[PDB]
Design a protein around this nucleic acid. Structure first.
Lengths: 157, 106, 129, 246, 56
RNA sequence: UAUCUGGUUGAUCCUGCCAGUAUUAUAUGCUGAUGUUAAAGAUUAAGCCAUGCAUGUGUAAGUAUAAAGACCAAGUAGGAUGAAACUGCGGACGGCUCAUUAUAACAGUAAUAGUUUCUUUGGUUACAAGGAUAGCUUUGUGAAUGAUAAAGAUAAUACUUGAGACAAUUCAUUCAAGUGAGUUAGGAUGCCACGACAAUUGUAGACAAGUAACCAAUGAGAAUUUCUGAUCUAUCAAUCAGUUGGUAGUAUCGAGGACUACCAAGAUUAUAACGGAUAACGAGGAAUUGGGGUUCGACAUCGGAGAGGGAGCUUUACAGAUGGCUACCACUUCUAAGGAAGGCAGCAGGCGCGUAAAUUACCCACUUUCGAAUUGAAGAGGUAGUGACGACACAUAUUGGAGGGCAAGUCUGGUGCCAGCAGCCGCGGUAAUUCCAGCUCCAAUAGUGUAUAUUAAAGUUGCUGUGAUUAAAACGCUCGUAGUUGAAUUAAUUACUUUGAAUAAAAUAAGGUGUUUAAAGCAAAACAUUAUGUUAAUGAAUAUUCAAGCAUGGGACAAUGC
RNA sequence: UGUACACACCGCCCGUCGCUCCUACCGAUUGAAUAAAGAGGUGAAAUUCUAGGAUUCUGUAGAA
């Protein structure tokens, strides 16, 4: 190693470069969310895969294991504020049943749509990128803001 | 030798049998620095001293143009293909040419 | 200079040792100073950490002690008559620990074996057999 | 290296100083004295981070050299003086008397004290030896060689010291009915009661310490530091009262 | 503003000035994105001698 | 994501390989809006270097009439300040590199009852003497170095004598309490060597300051040493003679064949000794991984070694120092031709080498170190410049391809087995879906191909896990040592298993925290709408971590003799 | 029924000899050299011991 500041990769490329069954499924979401390219799909897929790996590893231990109680609640707690997982589902098994639409539907470009500020999801980018939008007390212009539950009713022009 | 204490033979069997690997042995024994005209280099710089036309193999007919190139490190002579169509015209003699393998690993 | 490391010796299996580093002052050795018999002469060697070793080059007198009579008296050494290690020490009358030396009992009025390190402490001290 | 070192790289510094990994290349090497390298907090770190009086080392030398710090009864003017265990630290200008005790997070903590309780400080005997001329003496955990001691002050007791006078006020033996604070590894910064000390002739002496809440944890005899007698503490314990939450 | 620390030894006060839009030290200021609110540290040395001597 | 597809045939099922694919690190082609972060002469030559800097240091407390003190300010023992010089401290840290090195070093672990300084901390122990010396003056030489000669003086916390009155070292004898364990700390007797607490300093910040030894700390430190652990090779099977042990001595800070004298014949080896290879510095760690693993680690941090090659030494507490000296070997520089210095594997920079790698910039303000000490220095460190090595967020355009593998043209011109394309099968001999073109569209996107190498694919190196009738592959057969494996049974150690103890950080997983999110960082803020308190705020228990080592609960499965 | 044939026996295919190119191996021969670790001879240099004592200090005695 040479540098002291850490760095990381936000996404991974698919193993099979050429599939028709994947080009349509990935282009279904691009139109449904106005994403710039295929990096956003991979990043969201990469994000979910990390949580699924924690629950997958943790389901192999006993319920009275000290690490299961502490780490298990930590993952469910984190998801609850983010709002990916519904509150009434409070078991690690429901983590594995999450999909890639749960994470993408909490993005800022998605949130400003369903709240009604942006007519079209392509129109949301210009408003978001133009700093027209505000989250509580801070101006935001990154369309990838994964809003939490508390900040859901705090999205205004 | 599957026994519990039989890790000495289980290890000596694998050391010997790995030398039969045609590919693993190649990158370990000392000929890459002597027999290989490139060494561990990705490319190589050389000088042109002859332009060659190689007749194709049996199921083809034609003349694949080529050159004879002497490197600067080893000093050996190697026959180098000309990449694209009509690219023999742009080649000359006593000039630097970069030489980088082919699709297959040497 | 003389060295005292084990990097120059063979292994317990007889295999030669392959060097890695040059000589170092920690394992420094020094020339012997065979304290012969003669006039008084010592030299102060500046050892490691600044400490000073009295290097007796030639000596004539020593403070011999008698165990039976509980008396220690200075005396002039006469002749080195026996050395348990090297008989060539007897010929040159070199004074080392354990050398059997005969002395004149002039203050004893009131055979010896040395029991000090003249090359380290700087003087001869012994006892009477 | 041909001799003793002088610099200290940031990452080689003891972990319990909590120095930012991107703060800088080097860390303040604590000069020698009473407390070891890894058992002490340098006086610069006490003021720059723990108390935030000085932002950088420019303003730390402007303070310690200004005769504005009194480590124990005496006054120290070394920027990197080794400030270790419960040795008291006092600032007359701001009128505050801290103290460096441990806590459950393996960290040195500055427990506030009053003026009266800052006049004394507990020490732990390390060894007792007979000097030349039959002048016995004892050595505390602070490296202090106290003069003619009490005859019963044995190797692993705890004594009470006075800053103004320098005498020995009270002394606590090492038995199975005393309160001890921990200066060790996993058990570091924990208060408890000595209940059992099993002896192995070979290497180490192992002491079982029972916590207030009934938790039992063992340790090495070295890390034991008697703090009182009969489930009583002679000093104000830190905020967490030496208790560990699982 | 924010946290204030009283420093008698350095004869100064360390206060984190929040801007909600020869005896003082104004440094360490970083705004937010696109302007607006700005934070910083305010140091007051009262005596001019302090600024005359207590400055790197 | 525990994944495969094309290619042997007229066709089918196999073994089997080639090609395809994804990822990491090096170069390179084409192209390039932003903001954050960031590697960068290691591979080839530890090859050679012009030039500039990288180590100096002064407080009231060592010596100062400098003819310096009109610049504060006066001055009769010298006013506060003081260039230079002596004296003290330092350049043994830091910084660079990876040639040497195969039980050596290194990692964990244990010992030092076998050694130990420096700095720092606690403590103990004659109202004042003597010479000479620099800066200073004067006379000089040589081309010259950080060049050196005589004479005239003048100081000490430089060099000595001397008192105010013990300690520690050697030897011989003796009495003897902590510790697992000591003829041990310690005391007593007798001579020997050494023998002090400056013959010291502020008039102002009696109180500091300073000094000489000796005990204890700093020391978990340093240095030696115990146990376990390393890649390939038998076209390396026997190796060693200070070698193995003993006694006496020598030397060392100290154990010790470390060395010397005498005596004995011993020590290692199929559990791989001895030797050979390395494009070998070791570890923390990195890449990739369902599990098991494979490859890598010069390079943040720790340990080792070196300064062109050996050798030998001085100074001091520590150097076998090389930004110290001497000689030899090999180079480079100045020259008045007589002579003289130099060691960029320090920071920039140059030549060479190669596929392959940045400014002859600014500043000690952050971190820290050095110093006579708050003030000076630091090419350490920070800032700035180059920087499609990489990583993160984010505008509105290129790269490669269009038979199959593999998403994309039964579109139009020439060529006619020629040019050519083509990783593999293959396409082209006049009607080319592949050539060179034009239009159209496929994939990725500020990125996209190529070449080489590592990992997965590879159950094509098999412990989990392969194959041996016929595809490659059971010795011609028997005996046999080492090795591996060994029936049932019982109402002192080891191995096994469970808990801990102890255990550098960074890194990995991870807890919290809205850097506009993210990479990041360990910061901050819900809040007191804030000086007040939440607040003595958070610091992940951060878990680990293999092979050894310590202790403990258990005795079924195993091992060693009685 | 056998097949090594599938353009299917007008199939396929072996070996010497002849042409061009390429790679490794041996090698009378000045062949043959270069760079790396031991035995004997010569052996600079600095340290240890010994002799010396130019000079200068106390006024030849002694010290350096």
């Amino acid at each position: 190693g040479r540098c002291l500041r850490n760095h990381s990769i936000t996404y991974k490329t698919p193993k099979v470069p050429y599939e028709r069954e994947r080009f349509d499924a990935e282009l279904k979401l691009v139109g449904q969310f106005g994403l710039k390219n295929k990096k956003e799909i991979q990043r969201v897929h990469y994000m979910l895969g990390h949580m699924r790996t924690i629950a997958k590893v943790m389901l192999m231990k006993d319920a009275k294991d000290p690490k299961r109680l502490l780490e298990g609640a930590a993952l469910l707690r984190r998801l609850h504020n983010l709002g990916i997982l519904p509150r009434d589902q409070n078991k690690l098994e429901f983590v594995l049943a999450l999909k890639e639409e749960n994470l993408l539907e909490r993005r800022l470009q998605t949130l400003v749509y369903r709240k009604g500020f942006a007519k079209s999801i392509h129109h949301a980018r210009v408003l978001i990128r133009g700093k027209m939008i505000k989250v509580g007390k801070q101006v935001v212009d990154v369309p990838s803001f994964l809003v939490r539950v508390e900040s859901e009713p705090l999205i205004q022009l | 030798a599957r026994g519990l204490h039989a890790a000495r033979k289980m290890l000596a069997q694998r050391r010997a049998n790995k030398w039969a690997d045609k590919e693993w042995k190649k990158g370990k024994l000392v000929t890459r620095y002597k027999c290989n005209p490139l060494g561990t280099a990705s490319h190589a710089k050389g000088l042109v001293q002859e332009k060659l036309g190689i007749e194709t193999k049996q199921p083809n007919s034609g003349i694949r143009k080529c050159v004879r190139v002497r490197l600067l490190k080893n000093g050996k002579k190697i026959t180098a293909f000309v990449p694209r169509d009509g690219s023999l015209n742009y080649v000359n003699e006593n000039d630097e040419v970069l030489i980088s393998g082919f699709g297959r690993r040497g | 200079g003389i060295t005292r490391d084990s990097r120059h010796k063979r292994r317990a299996t007889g295999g030669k040792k392959n060097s890695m580093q040059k000589k170092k002052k920690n394992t420094m050795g020094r020339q012997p100073a065979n304290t012969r018999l003669g006039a008084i002469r010592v030299h102060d060697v500046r050892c490691r950490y600044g400490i000073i070793k009295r290097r007796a080059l030639r000596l004539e007198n020593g403070n011999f002690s008698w165990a039976s009579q509980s008396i220690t008296k200075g005396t002039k050494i006469l002749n080195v008559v026996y050395n348990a290690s090297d008989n060539d020490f007897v010929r040159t009358n070199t004074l080392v620990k354990g050398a059997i030396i005969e002395i004149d009992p002039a203050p004893f009025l009131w055979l010896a074996c040395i029991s000090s390190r003249p090359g380290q402490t700087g003087s001869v001290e012994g006892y009477i057999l | 290296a041909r001799g003793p070192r002088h610099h200290l790289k940031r990452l080689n510094a003891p972990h319990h100083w909590m120095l930012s990994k991107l703060g800088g290349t080097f860390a303040p090497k604590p000069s020698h004295g009473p407390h070891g390298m890894k058992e002490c907090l340098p006086l610069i770190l006490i003021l720059r981070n723990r108390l935030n009086y000085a932002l950088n080392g420019r303003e730390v030398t402007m303070i310690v050299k200004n005769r504005t710090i009194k480590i124990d009864g005496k006054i120290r003017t070394d920027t990197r003086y080794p400030v270790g265990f419960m040795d008291v630290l006092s600032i007359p200008r701001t009128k505050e008397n801290f103290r460096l005790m441990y806590n459950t997070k393996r960290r040195f903590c500055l427990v506030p004290l009053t003026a009266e309780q800052a006049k004394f400080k507990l020490c732990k005997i390390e060894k007792r030896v007979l000097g030349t001329g039959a002048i016995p003496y004892i050595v505390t955990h602070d490296g202090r060689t106290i003069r003619y001691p009490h005859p019963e002050l044995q190797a692993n007791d705890t004594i009470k010291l006075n800053l103004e006078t320098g005498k020995i006020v009270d002394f606590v033996k090492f038995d199975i009915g005393n309160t001890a604070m921990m200066i060790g590894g996993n058990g570091m910064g924990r208060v408890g009661v000595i209940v059992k000390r099993e002896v192995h002739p070979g290497s180490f002496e192992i002491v079982h310490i029972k916590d207030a809440k009934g938790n039992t944890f063992t340790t090495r005899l070295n890390n034991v530091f008697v703090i009182g007698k009969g489930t009583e503490t002679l000093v104000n314990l830190p905020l967490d009262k030496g208790i560990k939450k699982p | 503003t924010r946290n204030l620390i009283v420093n008698p030894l350095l004869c100064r006060k360390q206060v984190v000035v929040d801007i909600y839009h020869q005896t003082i030290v104004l440094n360490g200021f970083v705004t937010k994105y696109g302007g607006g609110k700005t934070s910083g540290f305010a140091l007051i040395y009262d005596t001019l001698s302090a600024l005359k001597k207590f400055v790197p």
